[PDB]
């Protein structure tokens, strides 16, 4: 186990903070909120999204061919 | 009245003679368990406002205890000041 006071060494940093009863819990919730989640979404679409559409494409084509394999089967049997 | 309560908590320093036996519960606990080197309550006044509290000095692993004890005393007084300690103050 590790306690405060024995964690690590810190040089010259000041930290100002404020009482919760003195500030808002939702500063600019929407004003600053939305823009940021856009920003984080943007920042990550390209690594998260691609594999999922790949699965998405393989899922719809996969069931497609499953029905068209049997149902479509006949087809032609002419004599 | 604030000055009286402050007197009750008082001050401490590691060169005070009489440790364990001090009337101030904070002071006695600080002395017996080596919670600090020095503490002192205070009541700064300016027009219509002021800072009222305590200031202490201690080792890096005692800041928590000192605070606990300091605060527990403040509360004790808010809710349980007994009669004689007030005379002393």
Curated annotation (Swiss-Prot), chain A:
Q: Which residues carry this modification: N6-acetyllysine?
A: 32
**Localization in the cell:** Mitochondrion inner membrane
Side Mitochondrial intermembrane, residues: 68-79
Q: Which residues form a coiled coil?
A: none
Instruction: State a GO cellular component annotated for this protein.
Output: mitochondrial inner membrane
**Which Pfam families is this protein grouped with?**
UcrQ
Q: Which GO terms fall under biological process for this protein?
A: cerebellar Purkinje cell layer development; hippocampus development; hypothalamus development; midbrain development; mitochondrial electron transport, ubiquinol to cytochrome c; pons development; pyramidal neuron development; subthalamus development
InterPro entries membership: Cyt_bc1_su8, Cyt_bc1_su8_sf
Which regions face the Mitochondrial matrix side of the membrane? 1-38
Membrane topology, as annotated, equals: Single-pass membrane protein
Identify the keywords attached in UniProt to this record, alphabetized: Acetylation, Electron transport, Membrane, Mitochondrion, Mitochondrion inner membrane, Respiratory chain, Transmembrane, Transmembrane helix, Transport
In terms of domain of life, where is this protein from?
A: Eukaryota
Instruction: Enumerate the transmembrane spans.
Output: 39-67
Q: Which Gene3D superfamilies match?
A: Cytochrome b-c1 complex subunit 8
N6-succinyllysine is found on 32
Keyword Oxidoreductase on entry: no
- Return the similarity comment: Belongs to the UQCRQ/QCR8 family.
Subunit organization: Component of the ubiquinol-cytochrome c oxidoreductase (cytochrome b-c1 complex, complex III, CIII), a multisubunit enzyme composed of 11 subunits. The complex is composed of 3 respiratory subunits cytochrome b, cytochrome c1 and Rieske protein UQCRFS1, 2 core protein subunits UQCRC1/QCR1 and UQCRC2/QCR2, and 6 low-molecular weight protein subunits UQCRH/QCR6, UQCRB/QCR7, UQCRQ/QCR8, UQCR10/QCR9, UQCR11/QCR10 and subunit 9, the cleavage product of Rieske protein UQCRFS1.
Biological role: Component of the ubiquinol-cytochrome c oxidoreductase, a multisubunit transmembrane complex that is part of the mitochondrial electron transport chain which drives oxidative phosphorylation.
Write down what this protein is called: Cytochrome b-c1 complex subunit 8
| Organism encoding this protein | Bos taurus (Bovine)
Swiss-Prot record, chain B:
Q: Which subcellular locations apply to this protein?
A: Mitochondrion inner membrane
**Coiled coil residues, start to end:** none
- Domain of life where this protein originates: Eukaryota
What is the role of the protein in this entry? Component of the ubiquinol-cytochrome c oxidoreductase, a multisubunit transmembrane complex that is part of the mitochondrial electron transport chain which drives oxidative phosphorylation.
Quaternary context:
Component of the ubiquinol-cytochrome c oxidoreductase (cytochrome b-c1 complex, complex III, CIII), a multisubunit enzyme composed of 11 subunits. The complex is composed of 3 respiratory subunits cytochrome b, cytochrome c1 and Rieske protein UQCRFS1, 2 core protein subunits UQCRC1/QCR1 and UQCRC2/QCR2, and 6 low-molecular weight protein subunits UQCRH/QCR6, UQCRB/QCR7, UQCRQ/QCR8, UQCR10/QCR9, UQCR11/QCR10 and subunit 9, the cleavage product of Rieske protein UQCRFS1.
Sequence similarity: Belongs to the peptidase M16 family. UQCRC1/QCR1 subfamily.
Protein name listed in UniProt? Cytochrome b-c1 complex subunit 1, mitochondrial
Q: Which organism is it from?
A: Bos taurus (Bovine)
């Amino acid at each position: 186990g590790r306690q405060f006071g024995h964690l690590t060494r810190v040089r010259h940093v000041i930290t100002y903070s404020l009482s919760p009863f003195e500030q808002r819990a939702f500063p600019h919730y929407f004003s600053k909120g939305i823009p940021n989640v856009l920003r984080r979404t943007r920042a990550c679409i390209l690594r998260v999204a691609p594999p999922f559409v790949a699965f998405y494409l393989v899922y719809t084509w996969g069931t497609q061919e499953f029905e068209k394999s049997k149902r479509k089967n006949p087809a032609a049997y002419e004599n | 009245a604030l000055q009286v309560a402050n007197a009750i908590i008082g001050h401490y320093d590691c060169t005070y003679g009489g440790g364990a036996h001090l009337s101030s519960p904070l002071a006695s606990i600080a002395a017996t368990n080596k919670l600090c080197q020095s503490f002192q309550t205070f009541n700064i006044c300016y027009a219509d406002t002021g800072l009222l509290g305590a200031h202490f000095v201690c080792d890096h692993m005692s800041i928590d205890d000192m605070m606990f004890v300091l605060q527990g005393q403040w509360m004790r007084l808010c809710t349980s000041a007994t009669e004689s300690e007030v005379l002393r103050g």
